[PDB]
Amino acid sequence: LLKYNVGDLVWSKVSGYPWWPCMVSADPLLHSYTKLKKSARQYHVQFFGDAPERAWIFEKSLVAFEGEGQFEKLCQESAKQAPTKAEKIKLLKPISGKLRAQWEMGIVQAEEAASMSVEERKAKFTFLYV
Amino acid sequence: LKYNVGDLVWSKVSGYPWWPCMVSADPLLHSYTKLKKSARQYHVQFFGDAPERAWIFEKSLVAFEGEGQFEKLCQESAKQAPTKAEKIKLLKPISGKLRAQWEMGIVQAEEAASMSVEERKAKFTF
Numbered sequence: 001l002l003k004y005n006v007g008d009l010v011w012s013k014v015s016g017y018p019w020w021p022c023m024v025s026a027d028p029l030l031h032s033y034t035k036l037k038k039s040a041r042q043y044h045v046q047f048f049g050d051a052p053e054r055a056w057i058f059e060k061s062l063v064a065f066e067g068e069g070q071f072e073k074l075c076q077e078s079a080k081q082a083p084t085k086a087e088k089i090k091l092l093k094p095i096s097g098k099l100r101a102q103w104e105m106g107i108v109q110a111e112e113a114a115s116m117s118v119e120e121r122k123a124k125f126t127f128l129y130v
Numbered sequence: 131l132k133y134n135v136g137d138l139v140w141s142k143v144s145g146y147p148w149w150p151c152m153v154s155a156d157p158l159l160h161s162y163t164k165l166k167k168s169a170r171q172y173h174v175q176f177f178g179d180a181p182e183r184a185w186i187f188e189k190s191l192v193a194f195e196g197e198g199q200f201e202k203l204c205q206e207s208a209k210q211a212p213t214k215a216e217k218i219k220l221l222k223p224i225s226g227k228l229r230a231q232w233e234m235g236i237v238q239a240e241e242a243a244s245m246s247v248e249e250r251k252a253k254f255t256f
Contacts, residue, residue: 015166015185016159029228030145037144038213051157055184056144084167099158129180 004043006033007118009065009110011074012045012057018095018103019074021048021065021110025126027056048106048113052127067114068107133172135162136247138194138239140203141174141186147224147232148203150177150194150239154255156185177235177242181256194243197236 004010004024012022022045026033033044035056043062047053063074075091082088095103113121133139137153151174155162162173164185172191176182192203204220211217224232242250 015171016156016161016164027145029231032145035145038215042144052181053183097158102158 003034004062004064005118007122009114009121010043010045011063011065011070012047012055013061013063013074013078014055014057018099019063019071019078020103021068021106022046022057022062023048023110023113023121023125025054025122027054028127028129046125046127048109048125049102050105051102054127065110065114067111131163131170132188133163133191133193134247136251138243139172139174140192140194140199141176141184142190142203142207143184143186145219147228148192148200148207149232150235151175151186151191152177152239152242152250152254154183156183175254175256177238177254178231179234180231194239196243197240 006025008024010022010024011019013019024033024043025046027044030044035042035044037058041059042056043059045055045057045062047055063070079088079091082091109125113125116124133153135153135155139151139153140148141151142148153162153172154175156173159173164171166185166187170188171185172188173185174183174191176184192199208217208220211220238254242254
């Protein structure tokens with residue numbers, strides 16, 4: 001019912017990627033965290049992991065983050081909606097390699113963040129130029 | 131395919147000016163091009179002093195010949211803007227930190243353009 005705010009934890013879905021743990025944050029060059037591409041709202045997110053990536057993601061590809069247990073249900077619904085048999089097969093491959101290691105590292109960071117207050121998690125996990 | 135890894139391109143992302151980029155392998159997916167079918171995307175790294183990367187639709191990519199192309203791309207994007215609000219935003223001049231980083235990307239892209247493919251791939255791939 002409410003708009004996400006800076007610091008909220010979300011799952012993000014990018015094509016070719018498993019659902020990914022993120023935090024809504026302000027774009028450091030645009031100084032906005034939500035905007036209209038003007039009727040389709042996006043939010044700015046940073047992707048947890050070892051690499052500090054960020055992106056503008058459409059509202060419909062974001063799901064509020066409660067914990068890693070949601071990942072099962074998100075994947076089942078992505079599979080039971082995959083149009084082609086070819087994408088269904090790609091979705092059923094257990095994630096592996098550097099992709100898996102970066103995703104598991106992202107899950108650990110997001111679960112630490114989920115147990116902090118918003119003001120504390122913004123201080124700790126916001127990417128900043130260093 | 132219209133581009134190979136190491137090709138310099140301009141990328142259009144909503145809210146951003148046309149931005150100098152290099153086509154590159156996604157470090158996790160290992161691909162540099164893919165279908166989201168019949169709608170091709172390419173993976174790019176945005177020049178500048180912080181590493182950013184994205185998957186961009188081919189229709190939002192233009193081969194990078196030189197800085198002089200920018201105002202041409204901007205004029206064409208403004209004619210095509212879906213709404214007058216978006217048009218007006220495209221016509222406002224860039225400044226502040228966004229422009230400083232844009233100019234950083236223009237320097238590295240010209241520098242990268244002035245060295246061979248495998249030369250540029252070595253230094254600029256993060």
